[PDB]
Amino acid sequence: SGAIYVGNYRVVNRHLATHNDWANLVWEDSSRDLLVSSTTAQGCDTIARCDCQTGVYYCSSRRKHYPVSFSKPSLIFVEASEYYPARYQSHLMLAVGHSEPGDCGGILRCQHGVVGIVSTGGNGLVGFADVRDLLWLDEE
Ligand SMILES: Cn1cc(NS(=O)(=O)N2CCC[C@H](C(N)=O)C2)cn1
Ligand SMILES: [Zn+2]
């Protein structure tokens, strides 16, 4: 589990969104595993506006923050699971690292702020859904 709190927005994995999230929906994209909903209180996270390929992520299955190298956001094939059929997930970045399904929501961050959240894993790799192109998150 886990979310990014920026201004009056809550950014979560779409496969983990609750009722309140869908009711107060701002934007969602199944092909990115992302969902943004409105909030009443202000969040304090800052989104990274950069092309960094190194950072640190939180792994709840290990209670540890790992420094990683990650690939640029791409269209990656993601096997079928209990949440989606086999499909291509867009804006996805991979790193060599440990993850389990319950790790989704863990923040990936660089010196500039939040880069994205854990979304995929398996085969000794961890996938993060990029949020750095979502410029509207800093305004309105
Ligand atoms: C973070 N993590 C997720 C997994 N397992 S997964 O890659 O099958 N994953 C299951 C939950 C939905 C994910 C998606 N975005 O399609 C795929 C392992 N580690
Ligand atoms: Zn950066």
mmCIF file of C-alpha atoms and ligand atoms in Angstrom:
data_model
loop_
_atom_site.group_PDB
_atom_site.id
_atom_site.type_symbol
_atom_site.label_atom_id
_atom_site.label_comp_id
_atom_site.label_asym_id
_atom_site.label_seq_id
_atom_site.Cartn_x
_atom_site.Cartn_y
_atom_site.Cartn_z
ATOM 1 C CA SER A 1 0.000 0.000 0.000
ATOM 2 C CA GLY A 2 0.931 3.699 -0.305
ATOM 3 C CA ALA A 3 0.045 7.023 -1.958
ATOM 4 C CA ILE A 4 1.584 10.364 -3.079
ATOM 5 C CA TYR A 5 -0.066 13.417 -1.438
ATOM 6 C CA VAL A 6 0.493 16.575 -3.566
ATOM 7 C CA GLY A 7 -1.728 19.630 -3.015
ATOM 8 C CA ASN A 8 -5.360 18.550 -3.148
ATOM 9 C CA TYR A 9 -4.555 15.219 -4.926
ATOM 10 C CA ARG A 10 -4.037 11.592 -3.747
ATOM 11 C CA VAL A 11 -2.132 9.409 -6.265
ATOM 12 C CA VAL A 12 -2.561 5.632 -5.856
ATOM 13 C CA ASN A 13 -2.216 2.346 -7.842
ATOM 14 C CA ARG A 14 -5.567 2.038 -9.715
ATOM 15 C CA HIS A 15 -5.897 -1.645 -8.672
ATOM 16 C CA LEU A 16 -5.825 -0.389 -5.009
ATOM 17 C CA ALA A 17 -8.238 2.600 -5.286
ATOM 18 C CA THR A 18 -11.107 2.751 -2.701
ATOM 19 C CA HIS A 19 -14.747 4.069 -2.969
ATOM 20 C CA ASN A 20 -13.890 7.618 -1.927
ATOM 21 C CA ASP A 21 -11.177 7.691 -4.648
ATOM 22 C CA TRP A 22 -13.630 6.729 -7.474
ATOM 23 C CA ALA A 23 -16.353 9.083 -6.080
ATOM 24 C CA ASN A 24 -13.900 12.054 -6.012
ATOM 25 C CA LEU A 25 -12.031 10.957 -9.168
ATOM 26 C CA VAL A 26 -9.815 13.492 -10.948
ATOM 27 C CA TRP A 27 -8.017 11.223 -13.479
ATOM 28 C CA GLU A 28 -7.294 7.504 -14.081
ATOM 29 C CA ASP A 29 -5.555 5.338 -16.694
ATOM 30 C CA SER A 30 -5.769 1.507 -16.498
ATOM 31 C CA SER A 31 -2.839 1.238 -18.961
ATOM 32 C CA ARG A 32 -0.610 3.099 -16.378
ATOM 33 C CA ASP A 33 -2.096 1.433 -13.180
ATOM 34 C CA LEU A 34 -2.675 5.047 -11.928
ATOM 35 C CA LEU A 35 -5.563 6.848 -10.241
ATOM 36 C CA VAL A 36 -5.723 10.383 -8.839
ATOM 37 C CA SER A 37 -8.528 11.549 -6.521
ATOM 38 C CA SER A 38 -9.243 14.893 -4.772
ATOM 39 C CA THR A 39 -8.526 15.532 -1.053
ATOM 40 C CA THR A 40 -9.803 18.089 1.483
ATOM 41 C CA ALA A 41 -6.440 18.705 3.218
ATOM 42 C CA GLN A 42 -3.166 19.717 1.527
ATOM 43 C CA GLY A 43 -0.460 17.151 0.877
ATOM 44 C CA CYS A 44 3.247 17.859 1.337
ATOM 45 C CA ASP A 45 4.929 15.686 -1.344
ATOM 46 C CA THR A 46 6.847 17.395 -4.163
ATOM 47 C CA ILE A 47 6.841 15.722 -7.653
ATOM 48 C CA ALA A 48 10.253 15.444 -9.416
ATOM 49 C CA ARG A 49 10.483 17.399 -12.734
ATOM 50 C CA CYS A 50 13.636 15.755 -14.171
ATOM 51 C CA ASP A 51 15.017 12.788 -16.226
ATOM 52 C CA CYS A 52 16.955 11.128 -13.245
ATOM 53 C CA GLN A 53 17.614 7.378 -13.729
ATOM 54 C CA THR A 54 18.845 6.813 -10.079
ATOM 55 C CA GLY A 55 16.951 7.083 -6.833
ATOM 56 C CA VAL A 56 15.751 5.296 -3.687
ATOM 57 C CA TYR A 57 12.531 3.250 -3.209
ATOM 58 C CA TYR A 58 10.655 1.859 -0.196
ATOM 59 C CA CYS A 59 10.191 -1.920 0.021
ATOM 60 C CA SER A 60 7.583 -2.718 2.694
ATOM 61 C CA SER A 61 8.207 -6.535 2.311
ATOM 62 C CA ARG A 62 11.794 -5.844 3.601
ATOM 63 C CA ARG A 63 11.132 -2.670 5.744
ATOM 64 C CA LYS A 64 14.067 -1.149 3.757
ATOM 65 C CA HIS A 65 14.854 1.749 1.352
ATOM 66 C CA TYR A 66 17.062 0.593 -1.535
ATOM 67 C CA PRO A 67 19.196 2.743 -3.864
ATOM 68 C CA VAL A 68 18.462 1.713 -7.478
ATOM 69 C CA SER A 69 19.208 2.463 -11.141
ATOM 70 C CA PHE A 70 16.035 2.422 -13.235
ATOM 71 C CA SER A 71 15.111 2.533 -16.928
ATOM 72 C CA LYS A 72 13.312 5.426 -18.707
ATOM 73 C CA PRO A 73 9.456 5.195 -18.776
ATOM 74 C CA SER A 74 8.339 2.690 -21.468
ATOM 75 C CA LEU A 75 5.521 0.422 -22.787
ATOM 76 C CA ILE A 76 6.352 -2.923 -20.989
ATOM 77 C CA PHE A 77 4.485 -6.283 -21.219
ATOM 78 C CA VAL A 78 2.932 -7.274 -17.845
ATOM 79 C CA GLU A 79 1.680 -10.876 -17.300
ATOM 80 C CA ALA A 80 -1.920 -11.553 -16.204
ATOM 81 C CA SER A 81 -2.650 -11.179 -12.426
ATOM 82 C CA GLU A 82 -5.853 -11.054 -10.229
ATOM 83 C CA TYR A 83 -6.229 -7.302 -11.125
ATOM 84 C CA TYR A 84 -5.587 -7.162 -14.931
ATOM 85 C CA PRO A 85 -5.435 -9.557 -17.902
ATOM 86 C CA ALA A 86 -2.031 -9.854 -19.725
ATOM 87 C CA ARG A 87 -1.406 -6.400 -21.266
ATOM 88 C CA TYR A 88 1.157 -3.657 -22.020
ATOM 89 C CA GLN A 89 1.577 -1.143 -19.177
ATOM 90 C CA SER A 90 2.728 2.315 -20.347
ATOM 91 C CA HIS A 91 5.072 4.819 -18.525
ATOM 92 C CA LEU A 92 6.686 1.921 -16.605
ATOM 93 C CA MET A 93 10.301 1.984 -15.308
ATOM 94 C CA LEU A 94 12.219 -1.158 -14.193
ATOM 95 C CA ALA A 95 15.039 -1.718 -11.654
ATOM 96 C CA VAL A 96 16.854 -4.832 -10.427
ATOM 97 C CA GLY A 97 15.332 -5.282 -6.966
ATOM 98 C CA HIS A 98 12.915 -7.069 -4.692
ATOM 99 C CA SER A 99 9.150 -6.600 -4.668
ATOM 100 C CA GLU A 100 5.909 -8.424 -3.856
ATOM 101 C CA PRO A 101 2.290 -7.317 -4.662
ATOM 102 C CA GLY A 102 1.856 -5.702 -1.205
ATOM 103 C CA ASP A 103 4.851 -3.449 -2.052
ATOM 104 C CA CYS A 104 2.698 -1.448 -4.582
ATOM 105 C CA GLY A 105 2.406 2.164 -3.447
ATOM 106 C CA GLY A 106 6.026 2.379 -2.184
ATOM 107 C CA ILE A 107 7.562 5.679 -3.306
ATOM 108 C CA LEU A 108 10.511 5.938 -5.697
ATOM 109 C CA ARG A 109 12.352 9.230 -5.099
ATOM 110 C CA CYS A 110 15.372 11.117 -6.393
ATOM 111 C CA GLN A 111 17.003 14.427 -5.230
ATOM 112 C CA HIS A 112 14.191 16.334 -6.991
ATOM 113 C CA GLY A 113 11.200 14.675 -5.286
ATOM 114 C CA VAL A 114 8.732 11.869 -6.045
ATOM 115 C CA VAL A 115 9.410 10.059 -9.346
ATOM 116 C CA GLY A 116 6.685 7.412 -9.011
ATOM 117 C CA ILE A 117 5.263 4.478 -7.056
ATOM 118 C CA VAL A 118 5.867 0.669 -7.103
ATOM 119 C CA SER A 119 3.402 -1.001 -9.528
ATOM 120 C CA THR A 120 4.976 -4.236 -10.950
ATOM 121 C CA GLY A 121 7.463 -7.015 -9.944
ATOM 122 C CA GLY A 122 8.739 -10.536 -10.577
ATOM 123 C CA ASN A 123 11.843 -12.218 -12.105
ATOM 124 C CA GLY A 124 14.097 -10.214 -9.725
ATOM 125 C CA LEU A 125 12.853 -6.867 -11.095
ATOM 126 C CA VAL A 126 10.615 -4.112 -9.676
ATOM 127 C CA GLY A 127 8.471 -1.773 -11.814
ATOM 128 C CA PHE A 128 7.502 1.814 -10.941
ATOM 129 C CA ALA A 129 4.642 3.821 -12.500
ATOM 130 C CA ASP A 130 6.157 7.215 -13.518
ATOM 131 C CA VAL A 131 4.307 10.421 -12.433
ATOM 132 C CA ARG A 132 6.933 13.081 -13.602
ATOM 133 C CA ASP A 133 4.977 13.847 -16.872
ATOM 134 C CA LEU A 134 1.759 14.622 -14.841
ATOM 135 C CA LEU A 135 2.442 18.413 -14.725
ATOM 136 C CA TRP A 136 -1.121 19.329 -13.650
ATOM 137 C CA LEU A 137 -0.365 17.771 -10.214
ATOM 138 C CA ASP A 138 1.564 20.998 -9.233
ATOM 139 C CA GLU A 139 -1.322 23.382 -10.111
ATOM 140 C CA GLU A 140 -5.146 23.699 -9.541
HETATM 141 C C1 LIG B 1 5.121 -4.720 -6.741
HETATM 142 N N1 LIG B 1 4.874 -6.054 -7.268
HETATM 143 C C2 LIG B 1 3.818 -6.471 -7.983
HETATM 144 C C3 LIG B 1 4.021 -7.809 -8.233
HETATM 145 N N2 LIG B 1 3.196 -8.682 -8.989
HETATM 146 S S1 LIG B 1 2.700 -8.281 -10.498
HETATM 147 O O1 LIG B 1 3.797 -7.707 -11.208
HETATM 148 O O2 LIG B 1 2.054 -9.443 -11.024
HETATM 149 N N3 LIG B 1 1.545 -7.167 -10.296
HETATM 150 C C4 LIG B 1 0.372 -7.607 -9.509
HETATM 151 C C5 LIG B 1 -0.573 -6.454 -9.191
HETATM 152 C C6 LIG B 1 -0.904 -5.645 -10.456
HETATM 153 C C7 LIG B 1 0.371 -5.211 -11.198
HETATM 154 C C8 LIG B 1 0.051 -4.401 -12.443
HETATM 155 N N4 LIG B 1 0.292 -3.101 -12.365
HETATM 156 O O3 LIG B 1 -0.371 -4.946 -13.469
HETATM 157 C C9 LIG B 1 1.179 -6.466 -11.544
HETATM 158 C C10 LIG B 1 5.233 -8.114 -7.613
HETATM 159 N N5 LIG B 1 5.764 -7.051 -7.034
HETATM 160 ZN ZN ZN B 2 15.443 13.873 -10.259
#
